[PDB]
Structure formats: C-alpha cells, structure tokens
Amino acid sequence: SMSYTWTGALITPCAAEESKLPINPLSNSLLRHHNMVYATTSRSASLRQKKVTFDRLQVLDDHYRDVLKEMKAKASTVKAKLLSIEEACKLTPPHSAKSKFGYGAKDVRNLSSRAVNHIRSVWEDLLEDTETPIDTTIMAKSEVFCVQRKPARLIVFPDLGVRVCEKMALYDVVSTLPQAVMGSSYGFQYSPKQRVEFLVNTWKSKKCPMGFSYDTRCFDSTVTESDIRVEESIYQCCDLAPEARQAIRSLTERLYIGGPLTNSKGQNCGYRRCRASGVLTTSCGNTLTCYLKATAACRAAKLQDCTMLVNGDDLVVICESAGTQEDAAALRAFTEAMTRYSAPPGDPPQPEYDLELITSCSSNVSVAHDASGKRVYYLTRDPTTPLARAAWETARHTPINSWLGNIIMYAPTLWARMILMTHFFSILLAQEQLGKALDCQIYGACYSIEPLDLPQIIERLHGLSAFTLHSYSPGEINRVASCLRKLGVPPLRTWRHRARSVRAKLLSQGGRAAICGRYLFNWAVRTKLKLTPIPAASQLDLSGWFVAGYSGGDIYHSLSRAR
Numbered sequence: 001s002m003s004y005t006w007t008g009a010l011i012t013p014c015a016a017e018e019s020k021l022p023i024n025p026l027s028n029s030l031l032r033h034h035n036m037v038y039a040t041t042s043r044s045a046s047l048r049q050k051k052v053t054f055d056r057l058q059v060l061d062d063h064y065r066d067v068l069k070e071m072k073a074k075a076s077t078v079k080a081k082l083l084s085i086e087e088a089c090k091l092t093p094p095h096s097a098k099s100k101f102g103y104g105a106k107d108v109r110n111l112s113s114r115a116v117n118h119i120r121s122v123w124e125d126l127l128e129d130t131e132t133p134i135d136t137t138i139m140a141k142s143e144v145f146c147v148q149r150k151p152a153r154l155i156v157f158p159d160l161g162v163r164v165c166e167k168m169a170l171y172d173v174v175s176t177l178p179q180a181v182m183g184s185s186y187g188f189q190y191s192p193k194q195r196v197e198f199l200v201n202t203w204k205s206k207k208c209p210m211g212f213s214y215d216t217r218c219f220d221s222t223v224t225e226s227d228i229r230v231e232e233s234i235y236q237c238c239d240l241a242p243e244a245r246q247a248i249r250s251l252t253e254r255l256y257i258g259g260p261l262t263n264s265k266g267q268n269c270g271y272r273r274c275r276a277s278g279v280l281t282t283s284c285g286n287t288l289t290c291y292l293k294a295t296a297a298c299r300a301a302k303l304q305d306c307t308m309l310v311n312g313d314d315l316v317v318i319c320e321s322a323g324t325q326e327d328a329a330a331l332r333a334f335t336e337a338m339t340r341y342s343a344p345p346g347d348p349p350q351p352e353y354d355l356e357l358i359t360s361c362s363s364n365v366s367v368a369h370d371a372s373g374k375r376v377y378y379l380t381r382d383p384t385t386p387l388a389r390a391a392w393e394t395a396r397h398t399p400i401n402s403w404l405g406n407i408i409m410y411a412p413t414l415w416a417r418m419i420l421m422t423h424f425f426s427i428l429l430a431q432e433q434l435g436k437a438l439d440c441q442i443y444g445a446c447y448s449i450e451p452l453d454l455p456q457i458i459e460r461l462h463g464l465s466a467f468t469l470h471s472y473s474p475g476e477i478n479r480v481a482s483c484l485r486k487l488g489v490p491p492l493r494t495w496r497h498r499a500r501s502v503r504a505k506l507l508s509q510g511g512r513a514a515i516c517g518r519y520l521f522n523w524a525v526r527t528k529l530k531l532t533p534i535p536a537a538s539q540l541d542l543s544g545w546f547v548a549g550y551s552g553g554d555i556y557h558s559l560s561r562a563r
C-alpha cells in the first residue's frame with residue numbers, strides 16, 4: 001500500500017516561520033557565516049511529501065518468523081503497569097501542543113477538571129470503540145542545519161487527550177519491554193560512556209571484527225501495517241491490565257497503523273498507512289522493527305556472530321569477518337533481505353575493519369588520553385549541526401536547547417568543551433542566568449536542567465576523565481578545525497582565551513559557579529586544579545535518563561511540583 005495518500009490540501013504553518021539565522025551580536029560571536037545556517041519550514045513540505053510517499057512491497061520469510069517468535073518469548077516475561085491519570089499528566093511537557101478541546105498542557109499538568117474530564121472520556125472511548133480512525137495533525141518540523149537544503153521533516157501526532165491516554169496504556173510497556181526483548185542490543189539503556197564501552201567491548205570480543213552501519217531510507221514510511229500489527233503482537237505478550245490490553249488493541253487499529261491527516265487549518269490533508277512520527281510507540285516500535293528485520297537479515301546473509309546495537313531506525317552491526325570478499329557478498333545479501341522486509345538502504349552499507357570508521361547515531365568512537373596518559377575511548381561527531389543549532393539558540397529563544405543536550409552527551413569532546421561550554425557559560429554568566437533551568441532532550445525525553453549542575457551530571461555520564469582529556473586524535477582535531485573555518489567560527493586559540501576569562505569569573509563567584517570554573521575549564525590553564533569526585537554526583541537521581549527512547553513521544557522527565 002502507499003505510505004501516504006494526499007488530497008492536495010497544503011501542509012500549513014500555525015504562525016510565521018523563520019528560515020534565516022538572524023544577524024545578532026551574541027550568535028555572531030560564535031559563528032560569522034550566518035547565511036550558511038537555515039531552518040526548515042512548511043515552504044519545503046511538498047518536497048518532503050514526494051520523498052516519503054511510495055508503495056511498500058514486503059515479503060516475509062522463515063528467518064523473519066523465527067526471530068519474531070524468539071522476540072515474543074522474551075516479551076512474554078514482562079509485566080506492564082497501567083499508569084494512573086495523575087502519573088500520565090506529570091509526564092506531559094509543560095509546552096506540549098494544546099488540545100483542540102479547550103485545554104492545554106498546563107491544565108493537564110495541574111490536573112484541571114476540564115483536562116481530567118476530557119482525558120477520562122478519551123480513555124473510555126478507546127475502551128469502547130475499536131475502529132474509528134483517530135484524527136492526527138500533520139506539520140512541517142522546524143529544524144536548523146548548515147547548507148550542503150534539506151526539506152522539512154513531517155511530524156504526525158494525535159490530540160493532547162489521546163497522548164495522555166497513550167502514556168496510561170503504554171508508557172510502562174515502551175519503557176521496559178525493549179530491553180527485555182533485545183537485551184544488550186537495545187541502545188537507549190546506555191549513557192554515552194556505557195555506549196562506548198559496549199561498542200569497544202563488542203569490537204574487541206570478535207576474533208576478526210567487521211562492522212557496518214545500516215541506513216534505511218525514510219524509515220517511518222517503510223513501516224507497514226503488518227509491521228505495526230507485529231509490533232502490537234509483541235506488546236500483547238506482556239502481562240497487562242484488561243483496560244490496557246483493550247487500549248493497546250484500539251490504539252493500534254485506530255492510530256498506530258494509520259489514519260487521516262489534518263493540517264493546522266483543520267483541512268483534511270490525506271491518509272497515512274505507515275509509522276506516525278509523533279506517537280508514544282514511535283521509538284519502541286521503530287527499534288523493535290529495525291531489530292527484527294536486521295536480526296532476520298543477518299541470518300539470511302549468513303553473517304557470523306552478529307552483535308547489533310539499535311536505537312530507533314539507527315543500526316550498527318558488529319560481526320565475525322569471513323574475509324573481505326565473503327563480507328562484501330554477505331553485506332549485499334543482508335541489504336537484499338532488508339529490502340524484501342521493506343527496509344531498503346539510503347546509502348549502501350560498507351564493511352568497516354576499524355571501529356573508529358563506523359558512524360552510528362551520527363557518532364563515532366575516538367581516542368584521547370586522560371591526566372595519567374591512559375587511552376580513553378569516547379563518542380564524538382561532526383560539530384557542524386551542533387554549532388549551527390547553538391548559533392540559532394543564541395539568537396532566538398527556542399523551546400529545546402540542543403546546545404545543552406550536546407554539552408551533556410558530548411562533554412568529553414574537544415568541541416563541546418572548548419566551544420559550547422565557553423560560549424554559553426560566558427553568555428549566561430553575563431546575564432546572571434547560570435542558575436536558570438533550561439529545557440533539553442535526552443533520548444527524546446525533555447529535562448529541565450540548570451547549567452550550574454553540569455559538572456556533576458557530566459561526572460556521572462562520563463567519569464572525571466571528561467574534565468582531563470587531552471592529546472585528541474589528529475583526525476578529530478582536523479575535523480573540528482575544518483568545521484570552524486567552514487562556518488566562520490573563531491579558531492580554538494580564541495576559545496581558549498575566552499575560556500580563561502569566563503573560568504576566572506566563575507571561580508570568583510564561589511559556590512556552584514566555582515565548581516564549574518574548576519571542572520569544566522581546567523583544560524584552559526597550565527596550572528591545573530585538583531579534580532576529585534563531586535559530592536553532588538552520587539546524590540543525582542538519573543533514574544529514567546538512559547532507560548528507553550521517547551522521540552516523538554511527548555515525554556517530560558523532570559520532577560512535578562506538589563499541589
């Protein structure tokens with residue numbers, strides 16, 4: 001069937017859309033080639049519509065059926081809980097899109113009578129009605145990139161009342177079931193330090209390793225109605241409350257498999273028969289589907305001792321090499337099986353014989369040295385998109401601060417330490433906003449974090465070595481330096497000067513600011529301060545941080561204030 005059908009009504013914006021990076025003094029201190037930075041808008045939605053619209057031909061075989069039964073046997077160990085309305089309301093982001101039924105996210109979080117009454121009526125309707133397609137809104141996503149232009153991605157999501165109900169029926173399932181089924185292959189259970197440990201240990205565990213990343217073209221569009229019902233067959237192996245079983249059945253038929261698309265103007269836009277990007281099950285569903293297809297494809301290809309690491313549609317496979325020619329042929333056979341399963345590649349996969357050459361989750365393993373000169377593996381990535389987005393976020397107040405998420409996840413990197421920490425600490429200190437909580441996203445969930453808590457967060461996620469790395473690889477240094485020239489970012493010598501300045505100011509303030517000056521900026525001075533474990537680090541409650549993926553799932557993970 002066609003992934004989408006369209007009526008001809010346009011994908012419309014709800015307000016004015018900015019596509020150009022503003023010319024602002026603060027963003028210009030970071031990045032001077034402003035014309036290279038752009039934001040996607042609904043103006044390019046028709047280009048995206050053409051790309052995502054195609055017929056799927058799916059052919060399943062015994063390898064696929066065998067893997068599925070093995071996955072279901074593991075899912076059969078899970079007992080999932082129904083969340084109460086209050087628990088589901090507390091998981092709603094404060095700025096989540098308001099309902100069309102007269103209430104918004106603040107009303108949901110406050111358990112207002114109107115929000116609660118409407119959520120209760122939506123829940124009862126899921127229990128009673130197994131068939132009526134649930135309406136969804138389609139919007140073009142506003143995302144920032146550097147030139148060389150991408151068309152806007154499309155987001156499809158149901159009303160606020162439905163999203164609260166999805167959490168009630170499925171939040172516990174999507175949070176616990178993926179690790180139960182996929183074990184060590186489930187990527188979202190790892191902090192960045194654990195992910196690098198898993199990759200390095202997996203690579204080193206092979207007698208002669210070969211690895212490859214597999215990029216599916218327009219993954220959500222390749223997901224079939226059969227794939228979504230197969231995904232439901234896995235959820236149904238859980239021990240579930242009867243209302244949760246019915247809600248999952250109803251949500252699968254009325255929402256997950258497909259449904260009508262409405263634009264921001266309320267006009268009927270078309271019909272979807274593939275994965276919706278904005279539902280609670282998107283991450284879990286994509287991860288399970290990708291794992292199932294790849295596991296089965298590995299068997300069809302006769303790839304030996306395969307270890308997968310999956311996060312949504314992002315897949316990396318590490319296996320036992322059979323020689324370059326045999327691997328080359330087995331990888332073509334893997335791609336052929338993935339294509340039969342309706343997961344064709346975007347770029348054909350390439351066999352890799354060096355772990356640092358593999359790019360997975362846009363990131364690669366690199367090596368630096370700690371204070372003792374000991375090799376430390378860590379994950380890095382090309383800093384182009386992070387810097388372009390940090391420039392945008394400096395010029396415009398944005399709901400999600402990718403710069404903050406990037407400092408947290410890429411804390412050991414040369415570019416996060418020298419540029420992002422320096423730039424934002426300098427601005428926030430000048431604004432007396434170091435203690436102001438900002439929103440960022442980790443594995444798709446929203447967190448409210450104060451920049452002053454960064455040292456202890458970084459220590460937990462990466463270890464104290466995140467504050468001592470030096471002797472970065474020439475390849476990593478060249479990539480950063482070349483990115484700075486391309487974007488017109490001041491050179492690393494300028495960042496060192498600026499860091500010494502903000503470090504001095506931070507130390508002069510004492511308290512949490514001085515801890516930031518000591519730990520975050522020790523790289524900027526020859527006279528190193530002694531770095532010991534931060535007491536606050538062991539006290540941090542990072543439960544929920546690296547458990548599961550929630551992209552598009554409308555999840556907020558910071559504490560709810562009492563009432």
Ligand SMILES: Nc1cc(Cn2c(C(=O)O)c(-c3ccc[nH]c3=O)c3cc(C(F)(F)F)ccc32)ccn1
Pocket residue numbers: 191192193195311312313314361362363379380405406409410441442443444551
């Ligand atoms: N492109 C992708 C990424 C993922 C998963 N993912 C995300 C994500 O946005 O979900 C981040 C991630 C990066 C920055 C801020 N917040 C985050 O969550 C991240 C960072 C690392 C690491 F390299 F830093 F370890 C590894 C995997 C990561 C899944 C599918 N496609």
